[PDB]
Amino acid sequence: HWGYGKHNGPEHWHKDFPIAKGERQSPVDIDTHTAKYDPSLKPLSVSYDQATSLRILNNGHAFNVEFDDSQDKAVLKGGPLDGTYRLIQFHFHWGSLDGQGSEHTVDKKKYAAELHLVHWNTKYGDFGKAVQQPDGLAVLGIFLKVGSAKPGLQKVVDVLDSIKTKGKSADFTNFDPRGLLPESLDYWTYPGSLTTPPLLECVTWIVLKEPISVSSEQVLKFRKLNFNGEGEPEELMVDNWRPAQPLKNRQIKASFK
Ligand SMILES: CC(=O)Nc1nnc(S(N)(=O)=O)s1
Ligand SMILES: CC(=O)Nc1nnc(S(N)(=O)=O)s1
Ligand SMILES: CC(=O)Nc1nnc(S(N)(=O)=O)s1
Ligand SMILES: [Zn+2]
Known part of the structure; x- marks a missing residue:
């Protein structure tokens, strides 16, 4: 029964999901001056030409636009990624x-x-x-x-x-x-x-x-x-957003100067 309210919002989630206080939580503040340009990062490859949307759902937290992810129809590759990532949904x-x-x-x-x-x-x-x-x-x-x-x-x-x-x-x-x-x-x-x-x-x-x-x-x-x-x-x-979490032992990399 988590949500975004005063009594079940982000400050409470750790009671049921202790990884809320973990070492690699999201989101974070992106300090643009401290992000490190990494010239070896590749361009993103966004291949959405064959994307097959199916449905839109209100899940009580946001709305999701769902895709057919049973084949490589809409994929993300490149960038920092190794291998192929299939689009399953988007939301806001x-x-x-x-x-x-x-x-x-x-x-x-x-x-x-x-x-x-x-x-x-x-x-x-x-x-x-x-x-x-x-x-x-x-x-x-x-x-x-x-x-x-x-x-x-x-x-x-x-x-x-x-x-x-x-x-x-x-x-x-x-x-x-x-x-x-x-x-x-x-x-x-x-x-x-x-x-x-x-x-x-x-x-x-x-x-x-x-x-x-x-x-x-x-x-x-x-x-x-x-x-x-x-x-x-x-x-x-x-207000269905989680605030920025501590960066801890992470560096944000930039693809650009
Ligand atoms: C009644 C009530 O508060 N139930 C909850 N269930 N999980 C919650 S939490 N810690 O994930 O926000 S609160
Ligand atoms: C055209 C363009 O890039 N506009 C931008 N506006 N804000 C930016 S941000 N997220 O780097 O602060 S980039
Ligand atoms: C099915 C699925 O995508 N679940 C998600 N839960 N949180 C997400 S987010 N805000 O980190 O993109 S995606
Ligand atoms: Zn999200």
Whole structure:
């Protein structure tokens, strides 16, 4: 029964998930001046041309756009990664206000939201096995700032009315996640964790430097979602972000100067 409220939010999670206090937790603050340029980091290879979206689900914590990950259709390779990582889902974290919502921060700056494209290492066969491995997942994180609309986001925005409450899903086929990416694939990378329980330390984080712009109306629609199920008192789905965790014995690497 974890969540984002005063009595079950991030400061409480450690009681049920003691790895919350572990050595490689996420998110973190990205101190841009202390990140180390690593010229041997390769360009990211984002291969989403054959991506097959299936469904969108309100899980009571966020909404997930799910993909067919039973073949190498949408994969992430390159960068800091060895091998092939299949896209399973994407989701966002966002705030009640435009000045908060991201999980990662950049020189302590918070963005209005953060997109997470979640991928798992095919050598482990399935996501459940991958999350038990230190190199099991690769999450591509993209910041959202409020300004001009993101045309490639609007099909997601438009369906949210149909998944207002926890447990609701809708068909969501033929969505092209390439429409969510910024122009540049410059990134920061570090070893971390899932940012929600069970907080497993299985993630290679790849956080893009360049934010995408979304409109105020687009993020306002995110904020009309509900944490609660249908027929329960309304709890707006806002502030579903974990704050930055201690970096501990990690160095953030940059792909760019
Ligand atoms: C009633 C209640 O608080 N149940 C909880 N279950 N897990 C929680 S936690 N520590 O993961 O936030 S709180
Ligand atoms: C199925 C799945 O992807 N679960 C996740 N839990 N937390 C995640 S995050 N915020 O670290 O990307 S992904
Ligand atoms: C075009 C471009 O790169 N814009 C940026 N805005 N902020 C940046 S950040 N995350 O490095 O602070 S990069
Ligand atoms: Zn996330």
